[PDB]
Amino acid sequence: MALYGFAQGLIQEAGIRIKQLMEQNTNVDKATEDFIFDTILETYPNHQVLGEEGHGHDIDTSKGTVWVVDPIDGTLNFVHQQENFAISIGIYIDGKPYAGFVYDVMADVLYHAKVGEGAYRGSQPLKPLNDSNLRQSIIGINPNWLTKPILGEIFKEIVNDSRSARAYGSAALEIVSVATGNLEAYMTPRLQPWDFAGGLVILYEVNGQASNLLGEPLTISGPNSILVGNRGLHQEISNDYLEPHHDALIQLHEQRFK
Amino acid sequence: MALYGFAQGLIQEAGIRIKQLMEQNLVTNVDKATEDFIFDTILETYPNHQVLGEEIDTSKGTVWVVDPIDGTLNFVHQQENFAISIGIYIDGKPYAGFVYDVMADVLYHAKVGEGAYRGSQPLKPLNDSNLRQSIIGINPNWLTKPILGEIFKEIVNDSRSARAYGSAALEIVSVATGNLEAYMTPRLQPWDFAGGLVILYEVNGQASNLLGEPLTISGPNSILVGNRGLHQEISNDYLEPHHDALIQLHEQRF
Numbered sequence: 248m249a250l251y252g253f254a255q256g257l258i259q260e261a262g263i264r265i266k267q268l269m270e271q272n273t274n275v276d277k278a279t280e281d282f283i284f285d286t287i288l289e290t291y292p293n294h295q296v297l298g299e300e301g302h303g304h305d306i307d308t309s310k311g312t313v314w315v316v317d318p319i320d321g322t323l324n325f326v327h328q329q330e331n332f333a334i335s336i337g338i339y340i341d342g343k344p345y346a347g348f349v350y351d352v353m354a355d356v357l358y359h360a361k362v363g364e365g366a367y368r369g370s371q372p373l374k375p376l377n378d379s380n381l382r383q384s385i386i387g388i389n390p391n392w393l394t395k396p397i398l399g400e401i402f403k404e405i406v407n408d409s410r411s412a413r414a415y416g417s418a419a420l421e422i423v424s425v426a427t428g429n430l431e432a433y434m435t436p437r438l439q440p441w442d443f444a445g446g447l448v449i450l451y452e453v454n455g456q457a458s459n460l461l462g463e464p465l466t467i468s469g470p471n472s473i474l475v476g477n478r479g480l481h482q483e484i485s486n487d488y489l490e491p492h493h494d495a496l497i498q499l500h501e502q503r504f505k
Numbered sequence: 506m507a508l509y510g511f512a513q514g515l516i517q518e519a520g521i522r523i524k525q526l527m528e529q530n531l532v533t534n535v536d537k538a539t540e541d542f543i544f545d546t547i548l549e550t551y552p553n554h555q556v557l558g559e560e561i562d563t564s565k566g567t568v569w570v571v572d573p574i575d576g577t578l579n580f581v582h583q584q585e586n587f588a589i590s591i592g593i594y595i596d597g598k599p600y601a602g603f604v605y606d607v608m609a610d611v612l613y614h615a616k617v618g619e620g621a622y623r624g625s626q627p628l629k630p631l632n633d634s635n636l637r638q639s640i641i642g643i644n645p646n647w648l649t650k651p652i653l654g655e656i657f658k659e660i661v662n663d664s665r666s667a668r669a670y671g672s673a674a675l676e677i678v679s680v681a682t683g684n685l686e687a688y689m690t691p692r693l694q695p696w697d698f699a700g701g702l703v704i705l706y707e708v709n710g711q712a713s714n715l716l717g718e719p720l721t722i723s724g725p726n727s728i729l730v731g732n733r734g735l736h737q738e739i740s741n742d743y744l745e746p747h748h749d750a751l752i753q754l755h756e757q758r759f
C-alpha cells in the first residue's frame with residue numbers, strides 16, 4: 248500500500264515535470280527516466296529499475312522488487328502531436344506482477360491496477376471484458392507490419408476478417424484500449440518489457456489475455472511479439488490465423504530475438 | 506454570417522441531442538434521429554436549399570453536404586471519436602465547414618476566406634514537411650488490397666509512422682490541426698470530406714484525389730490531403746509512377 252501509494256505519486260510527479268519541460272520551450276525521456284530512477288532509489292535503495300533509456304539491462308528481473316519503466320511511450324506522438332503519449336510503470340515482486348500504471352499525461356488520465364484488486368481509469372472501475380468474434384472486432388495494428396516480407400501476409404487475413412483496424416502509436420495506451428474495451432484486440436511483432444509491463448496488469452485485471460504471437464506467455468525477462476484481446480477473440484486470432492503459420496512465425500521469431 | 510450562424514447553432518444542438526440519446530439507452534436510430542433533425546431543420550428554414558447526405562446538381566444554389574455521424578464504428582465500439590460533418594456550398598463554391606467531435610466537445614469550423622477555428626481559437630497555418638519526418642493517416646485495410654497494397658506499401662515504408670483513427674472527417678481535421686502531416690484513402694463520399702476540406706484549405710492545406718485531380722462534391726473519390734510540400738512529394742514521387750494503375754482502379758471503382 249505504501250509502495251502503491253509511493254508509486255502513484257511518483258508517476259504523477261513525473262508527469263508534472265514533463266509538462267514543465269514542454270510549456271517551457273530525447274533529453275526529455277532521459278530527464279524523466281533519471282527523475283524516476285533517482286526518486287525510486289532514494290526511498291528503496293535495494294529495488295531495481297528496468298528502463299528503456301538505459302537502466303537495468305542484464306538484471307535478473309525475477310529477483311526482488313523490479314520497476315519496469317518507459318518514461319515516454321509514444322515519443323513520435325510526443326514530438327508530432329504533443330499528446331497521446333504515456334508514462335508506463337510496472338512493479339513486479341519476486342518475478343510476479345504487483346501493480347501497473349499507464350498515465351496519459353496530456354489527457355490527465357491515470358490507468359492503474361493492483362493484482363487481484365481490479366483496474367481503474369482514475370477513480371472509475373473498469374468492467375470485465377466480454378468475448379467478441381473477429382468479424383465484429385476493431386483491432387489495433389499498425390500499417391507498417393503489413394508491408395513486411397511474410398509477417399505482412401499472415402496479418403492481412405486478420406485485418407480482412409476484422410471489422411476494422413486502428414493504430415494510435417502507443418503500445419502502452421493500445422494495451423489499455425483493449426483493457427477499457429476501446430479495441431477488442433491489439434498486436435505487434437516487437438515490444439520491449441517496458442512497453443507492456445504496466446499495461447498487462449491492468450489488462451489481466453479485466454480478464455483480458457496476453458501472449459506472444461505463438462501463444463507463449465509474456466514476461467519481463469525479454470522483448471517479445473504481442474497478441475492481446477478478450478479471451479474469445481484471442482483464441483480465434485491465435486487458433487485460426489496464427490497457428491496455421493506456426494513454422495513461418497517460429498523462424499521469424501528466432502530471427503528477431505537472436 | 507446569417508447562414509454560418511444558423512449552421513454553427515444547428516450542429517452544436519445536434520451533438521447535444523446525440524448525447525441525450527446515449528445517456529438514455531442504438532447507433533441505427535441515433536443516426537436516424539440526427540439526420541432527421543438536421544435535414545428537417547435546414548429544409549424548414551431554407552426550403553430552396555439542397556441537402557446531400559447518405560440516405561442533384563451541386564453547382565446550383567446552396568448545397569449542404571451532411572454526415573450526421575461519421576465514425577459509426579467508433580460510435581458503437583468506443584462511444585467516442587465520431588463526428589457530425591457539414592459542408593455548405595453556394596453556386597458550386599465552398600462556403601463553410603464544420604466537424605463536431607461530439608464527445609470531445611470540440612467544434613472545428615471555418616468560413617472560406619476567414620480562417621479556421623477550434624471553438625473560438627484560430628488555427629495555425631500549416632508548414633511543409635518531408636514524408637520521411639511525417640506521420641500519415643492510412644488504414645491497414647488499404648494495405649491488403651491487390652494493387653492498392655503495393656502502391657501504398659512504398660509510402661508507408663518511407664513515412665516516419667502511420668496512424669488510423671477511423672473517421673475521415675476527424676482525420677482530415679487532424680491534418681488541419683498539425684496532428685497528422687497527411688491522410689489518404691481510396692474511397693470517400695462527399696459528406697465525409699466536405700466539412701474538413703474547408704477547414705483544411707483555411708490553414709493552407711492542400712487536397713486532391715489520388716490522381717492529383719481537384720476534389721468536388723459531385724461524387725465519391727479517393728483522397729490525398731496534407732501540407733503543401735508533402736502533398737507534392739507523395740503525389741509526384743510515390744503516386745505519379747502508378748498513374749495508369751491508379752486510373753484503372755478509379756475507373757473500376759467509380
Ligand SMILES: O=P([O-])([O-])O[C@@H]1[C@H](O)[C@H](O)[C@@H](O)[C@H](O)[C@H]1O
Nearest residue numbers: 319320321322323416417418419
Ligand atoms: O519509442 P517509444 O515511443 O517509447 O515506443 C514505441 C511505441 O510503443 C510505438 O507505438 C510502438 O509501435 C513501438 O513498437 C515502440 O517502440
Ligand SMILES: [Ca+2]
Nearest residue numbers: 299317319320
Ligand atoms: Ca520511450
Ligand SMILES: [Ca+2]
Nearest residue numbers: 317320321442
Ligand atoms: Ca516505448
Ligand SMILES: [Ca+2]
Nearest residue numbers: 572573574575
Ligand atoms: Ca455516416
Ligand SMILES: [Ca+2]
Nearest residue numbers: 572575576697
Ligand atoms: Ca462517413
